Amino acid sequence: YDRKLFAKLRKLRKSIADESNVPPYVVFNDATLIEMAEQMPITASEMLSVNGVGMRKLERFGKPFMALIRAHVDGD
Amino acid sequence: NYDRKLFAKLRKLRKSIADESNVPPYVVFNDATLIEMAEQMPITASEMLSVNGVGMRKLERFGKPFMALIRAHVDGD
Amino acid sequence: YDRKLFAKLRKLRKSIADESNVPPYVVFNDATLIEMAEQMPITASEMLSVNGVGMRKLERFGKPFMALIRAHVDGD
């Protein structure tokens, strides 16, 4: 598990939710973020196996989240 | 006694999943089940099935996210 | 998308946001930066084609981002 990545995921979700003017959970719930911080999905397929992530959420939110995880793992 | 911090997390997760699916919160898990989860902190399929109000159907449908939340809590993650 | 450009775009965004005392997303959101990294817009018209880039933001933040992208694509 990566705690630093989890904090980064929470911050991204907050940014998207604030800009979109929706409660953070409407973007993703905490369990989805935890799995992301565990599985560290970097591809579309990897993202779609994370619970809470359907094709709808993948199109709207997928790129920023994948990019964040990729950058964290690559050490940027 | 149950972990009140975990119960409140489970409550928020349930609200999120229930709102998503457009069902009453109890249709996911009722309050008594959540409290039992906050008491027993189930982390595997077997442990979840030991909890009142959790059968194989609910485990299939809702199990993963709740287990992920409990596992992260018990590890302080 | 170009990952090294995306990194550079994030750094410029952070610098503008820090100076302005705003969260980075308020300058441009993550998805907008990713599209810039994808399409590498150099002209004003190309920049305006990017989601989340209106004329107001262009006047305010446009020139530094255009200069950055151009210097990246050319090897400056």
PDB file of all heavy atoms in Angstrom, chain A residues 11 15 19, chain C residues 9-18 20-30 32-33 57 61 65:
ATOM      1  N   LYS A  11      -6.481  14.418  -3.042  1.00  0.00           N
ATOM      2  CA  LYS A  11      -6.292  15.793  -3.520  1.00  0.00           C
ATOM      3  C   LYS A  11      -6.804  15.996  -4.956  1.00  0.00           C
ATOM      4  O   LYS A  11      -7.460  17.005  -5.249  1.00  0.00           O
ATOM      5  CB  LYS A  11      -4.806  16.192  -3.407  1.00  0.00           C
ATOM      6  CG  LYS A  11      -4.493  17.657  -3.729  1.00  0.00           C
ATOM      7  CD  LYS A  11      -2.988  17.856  -4.032  1.00  0.00           C
ATOM      8  CE  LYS A  11      -2.342  18.818  -3.041  1.00  0.00           C
ATOM      9  NZ  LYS A  11      -0.835  18.857  -3.168  1.00  0.00           N
ATOM     10  N   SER A  15     -10.006  18.369  -6.104  1.00  0.00           N
ATOM     11  CA  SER A  15      -9.874  19.345  -7.194  1.00  0.00           C
ATOM     12  C   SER A  15     -10.972  19.195  -8.244  1.00  0.00           C
ATOM     13  O   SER A  15     -11.596  20.175  -8.649  1.00  0.00           O
ATOM     14  CB  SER A  15      -8.499  19.212  -7.876  1.00  0.00           C
ATOM     15  OG  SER A  15      -7.438  19.455  -6.965  1.00  0.00           O
ATOM     16  N   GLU A  19     -14.151  21.856  -8.637  1.00  0.00           N
ATOM     17  CA  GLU A  19     -14.343  22.486  -9.946  1.00  0.00           C
ATOM     18  C   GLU A  19     -15.701  22.140 -10.552  1.00  0.00           C
ATOM     19  O   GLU A  19     -16.362  23.003 -11.123  1.00  0.00           O
ATOM     20  CB  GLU A  19     -13.231  22.097 -10.927  1.00  0.00           C
ATOM     21  CG  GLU A  19     -13.289  22.904 -12.222  1.00  0.00           C
ATOM     22  CD  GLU A  19     -12.181  22.571 -13.193  1.00  0.00           C
ATOM     23  OE1 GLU A  19     -11.872  21.379 -13.366  1.00  0.00           O
ATOM     24  OE2 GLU A  19     -11.623  23.514 -13.789  1.00  0.00           O
TER      25      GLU A  19
ATOM     26  N   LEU C   9       4.518  20.993 -17.957  1.00  0.00           N
ATOM     27  CA  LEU C   9       3.245  21.730 -17.836  1.00  0.00           C
ATOM     28  C   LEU C   9       2.773  21.826 -16.387  1.00  0.00           C
ATOM     29  O   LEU C   9       2.258  22.871 -15.964  1.00  0.00           O
ATOM     30  CB  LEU C   9       2.142  21.098 -18.698  1.00  0.00           C
ATOM     31  CG  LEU C   9       2.338  21.162 -20.218  1.00  0.00           C
ATOM     32  CD1 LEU C   9       1.424  20.166 -20.912  1.00  0.00           C
ATOM     33  CD2 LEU C   9       2.137  22.581 -20.765  1.00  0.00           C
ATOM     34  N   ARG C  10       2.961  20.747 -15.626  1.00  0.00           N
ATOM     35  CA  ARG C  10       2.604  20.741 -14.202  1.00  0.00           C
ATOM     36  C   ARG C  10       3.446  21.729 -13.397  1.00  0.00           C
ATOM     37  O   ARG C  10       2.927  22.408 -12.518  1.00  0.00           O
ATOM     38  CB  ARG C  10       2.722  19.333 -13.603  1.00  0.00           C
ATOM     39  CG  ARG C  10       1.577  18.393 -13.982  1.00  0.00           C
ATOM     40  CD  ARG C  10       1.427  17.144 -13.081  1.00  0.00           C
ATOM     41  NE  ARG C  10       2.702  16.669 -12.537  1.00  0.00           N
ATOM     42  CZ  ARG C  10       3.504  15.790 -13.141  1.00  0.00           C
ATOM     43  NH1 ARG C  10       3.179  15.276 -14.319  1.00  0.00           N
ATOM     44  NH2 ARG C  10       4.638  15.423 -12.563  1.00  0.00           N
ATOM     45  N   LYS C  11       4.740  21.801 -13.712  1.00  0.00           N
ATOM     46  CA  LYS C  11       5.668  22.719 -13.047  1.00  0.00           C
ATOM     47  C   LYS C  11       5.310  24.184 -13.310  1.00  0.00           C
ATOM     48  O   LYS C  11       5.293  25.004 -12.388  1.00  0.00           O
ATOM     49  CB  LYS C  11       7.108  22.442 -13.496  1.00  0.00           C
ATOM     50  CG  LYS C  11       8.182  22.941 -12.535  1.00  0.00           C
ATOM     51  CD  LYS C  11       9.563  22.382 -12.924  1.00  0.00           C
ATOM     52  CE  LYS C  11      10.676  23.003 -12.086  1.00  0.00           C
ATOM     53  NZ  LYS C  11      12.005  22.383 -12.392  1.00  0.00           N
ATOM     54  N   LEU C  12       5.024  24.509 -14.570  1.00  0.00           N
ATOM     55  CA  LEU C  12       4.608  25.865 -14.916  1.00  0.00           C
ATOM     56  C   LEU C  12       3.293  26.219 -14.208  1.00  0.00           C
ATOM     57  O   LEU C  12       3.150  27.314 -13.659  1.00  0.00           O
ATOM     58  CB  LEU C  12       4.470  26.037 -16.441  1.00  0.00           C
ATOM     59  CG  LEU C  12       4.003  27.423 -16.915  1.00  0.00           C
ATOM     60  CD1 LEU C  12       4.975  28.518 -16.445  1.00  0.00           C
ATOM     61  CD2 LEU C  12       3.821  27.469 -18.428  1.00  0.00           C
ATOM     62  N   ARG C  13       2.346  25.284 -14.211  1.00  0.00           N
ATOM     63  CA  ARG C  13       1.063  25.492 -13.531  1.00  0.00           C
ATOM     64  C   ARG C  13       1.253  25.783 -12.040  1.00  0.00           C
ATOM     65  O   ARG C  13       0.627  26.695 -11.492  1.00  0.00           O
ATOM     66  CB  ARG C  13       0.142  24.287 -13.712  1.00  0.00           C
ATOM     67  CG  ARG C  13      -1.239  24.483 -13.102  1.00  0.00           C
ATOM     68  CD  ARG C  13      -2.164  23.327 -13.310  1.00  0.00           C
ATOM     69  NE  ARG C  13      -1.722  22.138 -12.579  1.00  0.00           N
ATOM     70  CZ  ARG C  13      -2.445  21.036 -12.447  1.00  0.00           C
ATOM     71  NH1 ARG C  13      -3.653  20.966 -12.998  1.00  0.00           N
ATOM     72  NH2 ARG C  13      -1.967  20.003 -11.757  1.00  0.00           N
ATOM     73  N   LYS C  14       2.118  25.001 -11.399  1.00  0.00           N
ATOM     74  CA  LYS C  14       2.407  25.143  -9.972  1.00  0.00           C
ATOM     75  C   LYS C  14       2.987  26.521  -9.685  1.00  0.00           C
ATOM     76  O   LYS C  14       2.595  27.189  -8.727  1.00  0.00           O
ATOM     77  CB  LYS C  14       3.395  24.055  -9.529  1.00  0.00           C
ATOM     78  CG  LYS C  14       3.701  24.036  -8.038  1.00  0.00           C
ATOM     79  CD  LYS C  14       4.816  23.043  -7.731  1.00  0.00           C
ATOM     80  CE  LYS C  14       5.535  23.390  -6.417  1.00  0.00           C
ATOM     81  NZ  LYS C  14       4.819  22.816  -5.242  1.00  0.00           N
ATOM     82  N   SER C  15       3.898  26.954 -10.546  1.00  0.00           N
ATOM     83  CA  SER C  15       4.541  28.244 -10.388  1.00  0.00           C
ATOM     84  C   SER C  15       3.536  29.412 -10.509  1.00  0.00           C
ATOM     85  O   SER C  15       3.551  30.337  -9.690  1.00  0.00           O
ATOM     86  CB  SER C  15       5.707  28.377 -11.372  1.00  0.00           C
ATOM     87  OG  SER C  15       6.181  29.707 -11.412  1.00  0.00           O
ATOM     88  N   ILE C  16       2.655  29.351 -11.504  1.00  0.00           N
ATOM     89  CA  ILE C  16       1.614  30.374 -11.670  1.00  0.00           C
ATOM     90  C   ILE C  16       0.612  30.365 -10.495  1.00  0.00           C
ATOM     91  O   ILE C  16       0.262  31.415  -9.964  1.00  0.00           O
ATOM     92  CB  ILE C  16       0.883  30.203 -13.026  1.00  0.00           C
ATOM     93  CG1 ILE C  16       1.809  30.589 -14.188  1.00  0.00           C
ATOM     94  CG2 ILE C  16      -0.401  31.056 -13.077  1.00  0.00           C
ATOM     95  CD1 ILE C  16       1.249  30.205 -15.587  1.00  0.00           C
ATOM     96  N   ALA C  17       0.190  29.166 -10.091  1.00  0.00           N
ATOM     97  CA  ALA C  17      -0.753  28.985  -8.993  1.00  0.00           C
ATOM     98  C   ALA C  17      -0.162  29.437  -7.657  1.00  0.00           C
ATOM     99  O   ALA C  17      -0.836  30.105  -6.872  1.00  0.00           O
ATOM    100  CB  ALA C  17      -1.199  27.525  -8.911  1.00  0.00           C
ATOM    101  N   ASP C  18       1.094  29.069  -7.402  1.00  0.00           N
ATOM    102  CA  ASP C  18       1.770  29.474  -6.168  1.00  0.00           C
ATOM    103  C   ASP C  18       1.888  30.989  -6.066  1.00  0.00           C
ATOM    104  O   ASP C  18       1.630  31.568  -5.005  1.00  0.00           O
ATOM    105  CB  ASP C  18       3.150  28.832  -6.054  1.00  0.00           C
ATOM    106  CG  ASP C  18       3.094  27.416  -5.500  1.00  0.00           C
ATOM    107  OD1 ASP C  18       1.995  26.965  -5.091  1.00  0.00           O
ATOM    108  OD2 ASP C  18       4.096  26.678  -5.446  1.00  0.00           O
ATOM    109  N   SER C  20      -0.034  33.104  -7.524  1.00  0.00           N
ATOM    110  CA  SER C  20      -1.384  33.639  -7.470  1.00  0.00           C
ATOM    111  C   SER C  20      -2.130  33.271  -6.182  1.00  0.00           C
ATOM    112  O   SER C  20      -3.204  33.830  -5.902  1.00  0.00           O
ATOM    113  CB  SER C  20      -2.172  33.170  -8.687  1.00  0.00           C
ATOM    114  OG  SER C  20      -1.963  34.066  -9.753  1.00  0.00           O
ATOM    115  N   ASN C  21      -1.555  32.342  -5.411  1.00  0.00           N
ATOM    116  CA  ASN C  21      -2.149  31.848  -4.163  1.00  0.00           C
ATOM    117  C   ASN C  21      -3.477  31.118  -4.411  1.00  0.00           C
ATOM    118  O   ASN C  21      -4.454  31.308  -3.699  1.00  0.00           O
ATOM    119  CB  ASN C  21      -2.295  32.995  -3.141  1.00  0.00           C
ATOM    120  CG  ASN C  21      -2.711  32.514  -1.751  1.00  0.00           C
ATOM    121  OD1 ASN C  21      -2.339  31.425  -1.304  1.00  0.00           O
ATOM    122  ND2 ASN C  21      -3.485  33.336  -1.066  1.00  0.00           N
ATOM    123  N   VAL C  22      -3.488  30.282  -5.448  1.00  0.00           N
ATOM    124  CA  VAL C  22      -4.654  29.472  -5.797  1.00  0.00           C
ATOM    125  C   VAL C  22      -4.247  27.991  -5.921  1.00  0.00           C
ATOM    126  O   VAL C  22      -3.076  27.693  -6.163  1.00  0.00           O
ATOM    127  CB  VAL C  22      -5.335  29.966  -7.116  1.00  0.00           C
ATOM    128  CG1 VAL C  22      -5.902  31.384  -6.942  1.00  0.00           C
ATOM    129  CG2 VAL C  22      -4.365  29.911  -8.314  1.00  0.00           C
ATOM    130  N   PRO C  23      -5.193  27.063  -5.738  1.00  0.00           N
ATOM    131  CA  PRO C  23      -4.921  25.651  -6.039  1.00  0.00           C
ATOM    132  C   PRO C  23      -4.602  25.518  -7.527  1.00  0.00           C
ATOM    133  O   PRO C  23      -5.208  26.242  -8.328  1.00  0.00           O
ATOM    134  CB  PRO C  23      -6.246  24.950  -5.711  1.00  0.00           C
ATOM    135  CG  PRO C  23      -6.967  25.881  -4.810  1.00  0.00           C
ATOM    136  CD  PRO C  23      -6.573  27.271  -5.255  1.00  0.00           C
ATOM    137  N   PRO C  24      -3.654  24.646  -7.885  1.00  0.00           N
ATOM    138  CA  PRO C  24      -3.229  24.489  -9.287  1.00  0.00           C
ATOM    139  C   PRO C  24      -4.399  24.356 -10.285  1.00  0.00           C
ATOM    140  O   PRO C  24      -4.345  24.980 -11.354  1.00  0.00           O
ATOM    141  CB  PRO C  24      -2.389  23.211  -9.254  1.00  0.00           C
ATOM    142  CG  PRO C  24      -1.805  23.189  -7.863  1.00  0.00           C
ATOM    143  CD  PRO C  24      -2.901  23.756  -6.975  1.00  0.00           C
ATOM    144  N   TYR C  25      -5.446  23.600  -9.933  1.00  0.00           N
ATOM    145  CA  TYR C  25      -6.526  23.301 -10.890  1.00  0.00           C
ATOM    146  C   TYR C  25      -7.229  24.560 -11.384  1.00  0.00           C
ATOM    147  O   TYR C  25      -7.759  24.589 -12.493  1.00  0.00           O
ATOM    148  CB  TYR C  25      -7.539  22.283 -10.317  1.00  0.00           C
ATOM    149  CG  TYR C  25      -8.542  22.867  -9.335  1.00  0.00           C
ATOM    150  CD1 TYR C  25      -9.725  23.471  -9.784  1.00  0.00           C
ATOM    151  CD2 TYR C  25      -8.313  22.813  -7.963  1.00  0.00           C
ATOM    152  CE1 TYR C  25     -10.647  24.007  -8.888  1.00  0.00           C
ATOM    153  CE2 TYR C  25      -9.238  23.333  -7.053  1.00  0.00           C
ATOM    154  CZ  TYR C  25     -10.398  23.933  -7.523  1.00  0.00           C
ATOM    155  OH  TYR C  25     -11.306  24.467  -6.631  1.00  0.00           O
ATOM    156  N   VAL C  26      -7.200  25.604 -10.558  1.00  0.00           N
ATOM    157  CA  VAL C  26      -7.849  26.882 -10.858  1.00  0.00           C
ATOM    158  C   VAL C  26      -7.201  27.592 -12.064  1.00  0.00           C
ATOM    159  O   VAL C  26      -7.866  28.322 -12.794  1.00  0.00           O
ATOM    160  CB  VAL C  26      -7.866  27.786  -9.584  1.00  0.00           C
ATOM    161  CG1 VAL C  26      -8.009  29.260  -9.935  1.00  0.00           C
ATOM    162  CG2 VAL C  26      -8.979  27.336  -8.638  1.00  0.00           C
ATOM    163  N   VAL C  27      -5.908  27.360 -12.269  1.00  0.00           N
ATOM    164  CA  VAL C  27      -5.226  27.804 -13.478  1.00  0.00           C
ATOM    165  C   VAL C  27      -5.727  26.959 -14.676  1.00  0.00           C
ATOM    166  O   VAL C  27      -6.466  27.454 -15.524  1.00  0.00           O
ATOM    167  CB  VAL C  27      -3.673  27.720 -13.315  1.00  0.00           C
ATOM    168  CG1 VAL C  27      -2.942  28.140 -14.608  1.00  0.00           C
ATOM    169  CG2 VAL C  27      -3.214  28.578 -12.133  1.00  0.00           C
ATOM    170  N   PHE C  28      -5.334  25.689 -14.712  1.00  0.00           N
ATOM    171  CA  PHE C  28      -5.917  24.694 -15.627  1.00  0.00           C
ATOM    172  C   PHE C  28      -6.029  23.376 -14.874  1.00  0.00           C
ATOM    173  O   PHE C  28      -5.116  23.018 -14.140  1.00  0.00           O
ATOM    174  CB  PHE C  28      -5.015  24.471 -16.850  1.00  0.00           C
ATOM    175  CG  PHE C  28      -4.961  25.634 -17.790  1.00  0.00           C
ATOM    176  CD1 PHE C  28      -3.763  26.289 -18.032  1.00  0.00           C
ATOM    177  CD2 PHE C  28      -6.102  26.065 -18.454  1.00  0.00           C
ATOM    178  CE1 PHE C  28      -3.711  27.373 -18.900  1.00  0.00           C
ATOM    179  CE2 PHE C  28      -6.054  27.143 -19.327  1.00  0.00           C
ATOM    180  CZ  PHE C  28      -4.860  27.791 -19.554  1.00  0.00           C
ATOM    181  N   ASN C  29      -7.129  22.647 -15.061  1.00  0.00           N
ATOM    182  CA  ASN C  29      -7.258  21.340 -14.429  1.00  0.00           C
ATOM    183  C   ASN C  29      -6.331  20.296 -15.048  1.00  0.00           C
ATOM    184  O   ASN C  29      -5.731  20.532 -16.098  1.00  0.00           O
ATOM    185  CB  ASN C  29      -8.725  20.850 -14.347  1.00  0.00           C
ATOM    186  CG  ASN C  29      -9.382  20.642 -15.720  1.00  0.00           C
ATOM    187  OD1 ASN C  29      -8.792  20.075 -16.644  1.00  0.00           O
ATOM    188  ND2 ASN C  29     -10.640  21.067 -15.830  1.00  0.00           N
ATOM    189  N   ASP C  30      -6.197  19.158 -14.373  1.00  0.00           N
ATOM    190  CA  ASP C  30      -5.300  18.096 -14.828  1.00  0.00           C
ATOM    191  C   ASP C  30      -5.651  17.633 -16.236  1.00  0.00           C
ATOM    192  O   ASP C  30      -4.763  17.446 -17.053  1.00  0.00           O
ATOM    193  CB  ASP C  30      -5.307  16.910 -13.858  1.00  0.00           C
ATOM    194  CG  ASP C  30      -4.402  17.129 -12.643  1.00  0.00           C
ATOM    195  OD1 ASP C  30      -4.202  18.298 -12.226  1.00  0.00           O
ATOM    196  OD2 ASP C  30      -3.850  16.180 -12.030  1.00  0.00           O
ATOM    197  N   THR C  32      -7.061  19.200 -18.682  1.00  0.00           N
ATOM    198  CA  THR C  32      -6.624  20.213 -19.636  1.00  0.00           C
ATOM    199  C   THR C  32      -5.121  20.101 -19.950  1.00  0.00           C
ATOM    200  O   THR C  32      -4.735  20.115 -21.110  1.00  0.00           O
ATOM    201  CB  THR C  32      -6.999  21.612 -19.127  1.00  0.00           C
ATOM    202  OG1 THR C  32      -8.418  21.779 -19.233  1.00  0.00           O
ATOM    203  CG2 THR C  32      -6.441  22.707 -20.047  1.00  0.00           C
ATOM    204  N   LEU C  33      -4.292  19.949 -18.913  1.00  0.00           N
ATOM    205  CA  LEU C  33      -2.855  19.750 -19.104  1.00  0.00           C
ATOM    206  C   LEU C  33      -2.555  18.502 -19.925  1.00  0.00           C
ATOM    207  O   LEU C  33      -1.677  18.516 -20.786  1.00  0.00           O
ATOM    208  CB  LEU C  33      -2.115  19.667 -17.759  1.00  0.00           C
ATOM    209  CG  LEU C  33      -2.030  20.912 -16.866  1.00  0.00           C
ATOM    210  CD1 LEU C  33      -0.910  20.743 -15.836  1.00  0.00           C
ATOM    211  CD2 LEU C  33      -1.839  22.174 -17.674  1.00  0.00           C
ATOM    212  N   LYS C  57      -8.867  32.804 -19.996  1.00  0.00           N
ATOM    213  CA  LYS C  57      -7.671  32.088 -19.537  1.00  0.00           C
ATOM    214  C   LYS C  57      -6.481  32.280 -20.478  1.00  0.00           C
ATOM    215  O   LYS C  57      -5.341  32.408 -20.023  1.00  0.00           O
ATOM    216  CB  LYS C  57      -7.958  30.597 -19.344  1.00  0.00           C
ATOM    217  CG  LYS C  57      -8.922  30.300 -18.201  1.00  0.00           C
ATOM    218  CD  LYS C  57      -8.367  29.239 -17.295  1.00  0.00           C
ATOM    219  CE  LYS C  57      -9.473  28.544 -16.522  1.00  0.00           C
ATOM    220  NZ  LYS C  57      -9.219  28.592 -15.064  1.00  0.00           N
ATOM    221  N   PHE C  61      -3.187  33.339 -18.924  1.00  0.00           N
ATOM    222  CA  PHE C  61      -2.167  32.292 -18.732  1.00  0.00           C
ATOM    223  C   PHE C  61      -1.563  31.776 -20.037  1.00  0.00           C
ATOM    224  O   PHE C  61      -0.610  31.003 -20.008  1.00  0.00           O
ATOM    225  CB  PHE C  61      -2.743  31.081 -17.970  1.00  0.00           C
ATOM    226  CG  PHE C  61      -3.450  31.425 -16.692  1.00  0.00           C
ATOM    227  CD1 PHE C  61      -4.760  30.996 -16.481  1.00  0.00           C
ATOM    228  CD2 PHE C  61      -2.799  32.127 -15.676  1.00  0.00           C
ATOM    229  CE1 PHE C  61      -5.422  31.291 -15.307  1.00  0.00           C
ATOM    230  CE2 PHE C  61      -3.456  32.425 -14.481  1.00  0.00           C
ATOM    231  CZ  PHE C  61      -4.766  32.007 -14.297  1.00  0.00           C
ATOM    232  N   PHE C  65       2.318  29.174 -21.426  1.00  0.00           N
ATOM    233  CA  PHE C  65       2.077  27.776 -21.791  1.00  0.00           C
ATOM    234  C   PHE C  65       2.421  27.508 -23.252  1.00  0.00           C
ATOM    235  O   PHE C  65       2.994  26.466 -23.582  1.00  0.00           O
ATOM    236  CB  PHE C  65       0.634  27.359 -21.481  1.00  0.00           C
ATOM    237  CG  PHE C  65       0.401  27.042 -20.033  1.00  0.00           C
ATOM    238  CD1 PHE C  65      -0.047  28.028 -19.157  1.00  0.00           C
ATOM    239  CD2 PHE C  65       0.663  25.773 -19.535  1.00  0.00           C
ATOM    240  CE1 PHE C  65      -0.247  27.745 -17.801  1.00  0.00           C
ATOM    241  CE2 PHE C  65       0.466  25.477 -18.173  1.00  0.00           C
ATOM    242  CZ  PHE C  65       0.011  26.468 -17.308  1.00  0.00           C
TER     243      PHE C  65
END
